[PDB]
Amino acid sequence: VPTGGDDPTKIAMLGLTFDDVLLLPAASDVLPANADTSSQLTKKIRLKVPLVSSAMDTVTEARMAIAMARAGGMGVLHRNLPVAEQAAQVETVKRSGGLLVGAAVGVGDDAWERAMALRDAGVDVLVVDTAHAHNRKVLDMVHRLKTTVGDEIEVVGGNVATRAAAAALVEAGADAVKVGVGPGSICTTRVVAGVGAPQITAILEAVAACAPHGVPVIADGGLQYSGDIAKALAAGASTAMLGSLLAGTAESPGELILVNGKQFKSYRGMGSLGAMQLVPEGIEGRVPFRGPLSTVIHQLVGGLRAAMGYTGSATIEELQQAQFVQITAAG
Template identity: 35%
Template sequence: MHMDTHEYLDFEDVLIKPRRSPINSRQEVDLTRSFKTKSGLVLNGVGVVAANMDGVGTFSMAKALAQEKMFTALHKFYTLEQWVEFARDNAAILPYVFVTIGTSEAELENLERILETIPILTNICVDVANGYSAHFLPHVARVREKFPDKVLMAGNVVGAEMSEALVQAGADIVKVGIGPGSVCTTRKMTGVGVPQFSAIVECAQAAHALGALVCGDGGCACVGDIAKAIAGGGFCDAGGDVGRAC
């Protein structure tokens, strides 16, 4: 057994140390950015993503967050008919949403139908609880091959090695986090995971070196944790309580 003696930190273990700034008020701060992806597309907005949980990543959430130029990873249970209706009435919101799938063949086929019907959709999220499963990297590579002109976010992983592998398989954004969510039992039931702040920092360093981005998925118990996730190098996937509060 190899024991990693490196110190790993969670959001509650760190604070952002202030520095002198020319900004006089928080009202002067503009969080919008242009995130250039490896696929050549640019995501314009605030680096916060509502998680693809069925109670969080909803059409109504997408409408609300898009007004603030934030993103939503829609949950994978919407039908093609529901997508068509949403797209027809909310074309301006579509750059701020991700179409989510898992790794099943049926979900990939459904993704193909959605993107063929609504080609102006540009963002895909491939989501599994454990990105270390043997079938995951080939699946991500297959999605990239089918959709070379889309932004591809994939995960979840918690370390540099798999972040690099995901980027090499075609991911534009590496989704980071195993078990950090407030309602997630992964760590208690399996003993698996890495404290979320350190996971974001490590994955961000690896992904950024290859020209990719990261999205910290989960663990944000308060708004300040979103700031810490962004400071650590990532988009912030606002799941759990924060996602519902947005």
């Protein structure tokens, strides 16, 4: 083995991230303005815009979930608050019309009680929200939810980074599989634990297990630019979950911060020291203030539309068949 040792499988793959690849242009009859951006969030739920906001307490509470649903996407309400308040935020969303909304639950003690309270409040999507879903306890929670409320509510499981982990969540009954171990902008899992999987390769591997069963993949974390959304979808994901890109908006939780004449909002991992107040696996940071969500989503969808035009993708399903070129460091 050229890299050392006698075992070819020790280093199992070469992991690519968004920056490692570009979409190749292809024959196109598609204009950006005419492309259909709708896509499956879960087996049953289709969104007009393939974007959901992260279940983080500096990204998504009721105001963000409302704005996301109106923009044609969806919010997933964070779970770093008492059950009653989370359920009350769900009802607040529903009070603003027939809006789609999701909410995160864990696999802890109150997790099941949390899930029932959220169902009572009328949630559409339950997101089993863990650092590592390749675990019997997580798979059981997914399964128990799907068997109990599966008729009324779609159940998302995450996060995974391998084909085998995605396959297990599919077996357990997940209506969608969320991919991302390591890539988050505020994530330090890679330096603290030494663990991760570059996101383009993780999506390709998860899609290989999920697509044959008709289960959509949510690409979660590491998206910095509107172009990364197109890359993630072309890699086979059906939607993208955004944290950093939405944390700077007016609709996110938290106040404006003025630093050296420029405006910011605070953005922090749910595994950061302050978010837990296990060693921390996230940082507490700041992102530039970006203004209204509707504005950000427009640019983001604008970039996606451009990619669909370049690749001749009339739909997201067609974009999922596009090809990449791998680039070098010089790129």
